[PDB]
Symmetry: T
Subunit: 151 residues, 12 copies
């Protein structure tokens, strides 16, 4: 992803798939902890939606063309989805969120570097704010799971 526009568009696809995964987690969750983690998936979705909309409209702003179909989202995203399954444990659900969040953090880091090289300081700030917040969530999720954040 050799420039700002490219990694912004990659983030548009990855964020769209992350949203979909978070929604599955929300829906298929069963086990002690549902009542706290089910609405928490709403908060994560709303935040993922905020990045999605901000990164897409930064891309538009720069002269680019955001991915904007489910097809383009699936094809371009590096995240893989699987069928919903009620028998997944809470720990496994939260671990899956952590993995998605680690991927997104690493994508925002790439986004940060690329935009830093090109002198696109606005795009740079957008990836940094998003990175900061995702990393904080990794700490909390990991701590729920009895672990160090291990960034």
């Amino acid at each position: 992803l050799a420039d700002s526009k490219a990694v912004l568009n990659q983030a548009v696809a990855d964020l769209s798939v992350a949203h979909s995964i978070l929604h599955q987690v929300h829906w298929y969750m069963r086990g002690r902890g549902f009542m706290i983690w089910h609405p928490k998936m709403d908060e994560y979705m709303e935040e993922i939606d905020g990045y999605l909309d901000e990164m897409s409209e930064r891309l538009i702003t720069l002269g680019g063309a955001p991915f904007s179909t489910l097809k383009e989202f699936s094809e371009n995203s590096q995240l893989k989805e699987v069928l919903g399954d009620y028998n997944v444990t809470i720990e496994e659900q939260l671990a899956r969120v952590v993995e998605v969040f680690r991927y997104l953090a690493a994508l925002f880091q790439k986004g940060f570097d690329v935009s830093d090289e090109e002198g696109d300081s606005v795009t740079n700030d957008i990836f940094n704010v998003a990175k900061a917040s995702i990393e904080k969530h990794i700490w909390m999720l990991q701590a729920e799971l009895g672990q160090a954040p291990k960034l």
Copy 2:
């Protein structure tokens, strides 16, 4: 509309005892999850109160006379109460809220059928709306307990 009026009053007694059970759960609750489920019982209590007041006033509106004494509630209710017990687990407190809810969901279907058979479309709606919500609570409570809703 004798039957619609009768099931409305049945609900008044059952909602009164359901309220009393939820208060017992809320008070005698002990175990991991207390801090989430104790205030959650207040929320369920507020919603129950809401049905009670609405169904009771629908009864008065139709020229009936709501049950309005603890004796009437207890005698007329199909719900049975037991002495408060601190030694009940959280899981089993929750499962008992589920049984009460499954009861109410059934009663509200009866109320729906009866009112639909009498062409009391207003009472019909009241039962439907209340049924919709209790059923959603049944899904969530069951999810916490690692089970399907099994309506």
Copy 3:
């Protein structure tokens, strides 16, 4: 602290029945002043429930087991309930609320004296605050009835 605990539990019983009586009044009310006094019963029921929840909790906090079934409330309450009746006038309904409140205020005095004698200053403060407020309500209700508070 057996006596403090005992009177807290008496209040749980009496407040549950007081709430049931106010609800009756609220529903069976008819006559000029209905539009102001019907919603006013909601306000009183809300205050009563606040007292109910705070006193039971304090009892739980003290190592006790509050009454938590309709039977327990009805058997232990000194208050008596009669079938709802639409023919009772507005002023009769108010007078019956005054009686209930007069009983609650006297009960809360006994709560105050007993906890004071036992040195349970937290419980003592709870009765005092509840008593202040009920007595204010006696004044207002009597004033509507054209009478002195007559505490």
Copy 4:
């Protein structure tokens, strides 16, 4: 076709009911003014809510709502009289009760016509409005020392 017709009728009758509530609001005198005067405001707002919901359902369905005082006045089954300060509180409220009984009946006819046409959306609008008007009948009737008598 007929559900369109009951929706338009409601438009006419809600516009007249609003004018009547406003009269009661203005001409009211006697014990209870302070509570019943602003109550007529809450009534007019709820009435206005129905009116706007129903004309818009009519437009949505391809209709042409009444939208002139002549159309309202001529198509409504409710009659107005000149404002009179001398009416008692109890009679004002009884007048409102009667307006409300009429609207509860019209909302019923509304429910039945759309139910037969299978206009389920219009069916629900009539059901929701009927529910609230009947609750109001209970309370007004209660103020007046009477049973609801629907």
Copy 5:
């Protein structure tokens, strides 16, 4: 209630795609009226997201398993997406939304009928409430476009 379940899942699919289409419209919009219609797409998206969650959740409550991957949304949906294009006119964007919305309303009617037949009154109301609001939107969008609703 197999057909109610199956119609809820179809909605899940079509709402997910309708949301994607509204998002594309939001992003790719150019021309007089942008300032009003661009944020208006967000309102519609929120409303769509509401149906999505209520419907998906009702399916779960009924013992179903909702589509929860982009692949499932894309392949089960009757709606079809095209690549984003800035050169479309405002008027063409709005008509595109009208067509998506006409589809949704008809889909909701199917859901209402199927659920009425099975006696699942709860799902029945959900479709009816959603149908009402989408129809209201069709009126407004058509009005902006100088046409009657033509339901």
Copy 6:
């Protein structure tokens, strides 16, 4: 007396003005519907505010306000025509402009008469409403590519 008379005239004209704004709200079609449709709602709330404040000023002065649709359309100098979807947005807005120009002239007559009779309270009521309707005329006219032409 003249103040009473013009307050009453306003009650009738504001009632009819409210009916016309509603029709414009409902029958509007064309580019700009999405901004002007809810905007008619704001105009109607403002008109209702004047309606109820002038009417209550009249009652307060010992008068008896018009309070039936009959009285409203008999006393109002505004003309209502049937609702017509094929009217243009710019034509609907020009129609609101006329009604407002009329109301603003009426509120001037109310200002004048109340000032001559010594009724400073009623005088402010007219002045406040005139200020606001005229502000609205500027904006409407500016949307139409025109000067206020007050």
Copy 7:
């Protein structure tokens, strides 16, 4: 006498009216208490607003408001008597009307005096206070079954 004079007069009279409204609020007994008791709070608050506004207009103008009970009591044209629970609701309201009628008259004087002096700010302050007090008289009188009779 002059703008400063009638503002200071209003200061003394508002302080005394405040005190009287407090009396009614406290000794009220009879059907209607539950509505009229808190209504007296609304009136007192409104009175305090006039009070504050007029004193500080007096200070702004170079004057020196009465700021002792001796001053309010000796300069006020209103008369206080001892509280009494045996006064009925009907009678309590009548006294409030009397106070408000006095205040409306005071405010007319303030209007005429400030208008002749060209002090338009004070003029507005008196006009706004009067407008509100007169509305309250209509409502109070209407609870009492009477016309406002300004």
Copy 8:
């Protein structure tokens, strides 16, 4: 004396305190005006709260609150002097401090009497009011570069 008597004495003195705080509010001049002028409003409001509560407790116990400026002025142990713009900020805050010291000692009196009587509700009112007043004394004194010296 008894709880009823000191409550009524509190009614007297709070009324007068309020009158004095109003004077400080109005007549204030000097550096710090902008912070201290609205601060007097906060204090007045808090004083009004004690007044209303203590008065209604009196009524509730079956007493009869002072309710005329005459009774307030006579029964209060606080002395009023004429408003004067020439007092310093430091002198103004000193006057307020002495009113508060007085009130806090009165509330101690009410506390002591009510405790002996066993009227625990009245006791609480006095204790709550005393708590807040003494906190105000600390802050006032600190602004003045002094210890609270209660």
Copy 9:
């Protein structure tokens, strides 16, 4: 109405410059009282902006052409600006705001008088509201400085 129009436009010019002067006071202020008076300038400026907007729009409403460039404000306003100076005292800064306010108050009386005679009552009321507030501010600023208002 040519004179009402001329005084509204004078006010547009004088308010623009008064705003500029208040911003200077806000920025360059030093000395005891900064913490209260610094944010107070903001309140004054927001008040000044409100008059600016209302008077300019009344002029538009009347058929006029408001000054709308820095050159026009500066050449038309009777108020003179000097360069920012940190060394001015708090008491000197407040005195300056007093003199600006005295001018505005006089300008608003002049606006009242011309509009009162010209029959334009709307413009008249705007000047009167604004004069009322500015005069109260004069009282308060003067009191701060230990002086009578001296209007």
Copy 10:
């Protein structure tokens, strides 16, 4: 501790400062199931402690006292002991530590209640009483989470 109201107020200032520090440690070092509810709950406990601290300290100043107001003064005068943060502590052990601190605070407040009562400082007395009431309520809820009676 022990002389008068002024002295127990100041003992509270010191013990509340340390209690705050312990809760912050629990908030930070917390790991395990329940983190998502109990991590933010620590913030609530901390806000409430801070409210006692301020109110008590300011009551002291109001009485003519000089509150402790350095870390050294807090840590030397307080009966609470702090240990180094440790992530391996279980959640149930974390909550059990909060209960101990709260049990200590309740006992401190009862002593403050008594002392101030003995001197007739009734304003101070109510401060201690209000604070004790809510801490005891928290001991109830915390213990309940831990499957225990409050055991005051």
Copy 11:
């Protein structure tokens, strides 16, 4: 010393003051279809401009500088040109004027970012970056309304 950071902040003060005058003119003198949306939209933009002006001016003060604070300094130091108000300018032309002022502000903010980056004034650097980010989004939006790409 940050000489050039201070100087670009002052250039921003003068340019923001003039930008504010121009949006106000567009606001007052606007006529044509879209008035009802774009007239209040100018108020939003003006508020945003005033925020930048106040932040950039108070950063400059904070650094020991001396902000422009008279109309004369604003008009003489600003690179932006004002012309007389004219009701006969179309909507599209007004929006174009705004787009032009915004292109300029974004180029000035870019210069502010670059200069402060070089002098190690990271705080000033973030102020210019935040303002730029937002101005650029508006240019996208305004251009879209005009049927154009943003062409940053």
Copy 12:
């Protein structure tokens, strides 16, 4: 990899705990004209300082660190010094000692910015920059009250 960023974050945890304790003393011991405004202003300062402490400690936890979490740790690692509370300090002096603290914090935040930039920790770098921006604005205002330029 991030050792130096971790160490400065933790330094800030200690310094901010001490800064909070000093603002508290200033809040409590303050006397003289301007008390009514500067007393509550310390609460605003205290809440802002708590926000940095919490965010910086959690950033430390997030990177794999172990934040200081005891008064002893705060006292021993902080470079700030505390003295006994004293009512006879003047307002200007109290205000000057807050400025001293804020100058220290601003320089700590600059160091943290620098170290985190050097290690490529852009998230940490931003936290210090935001904190610095705000602390420096307060120095400006406090100095202005004291009749001085900011002197950063």
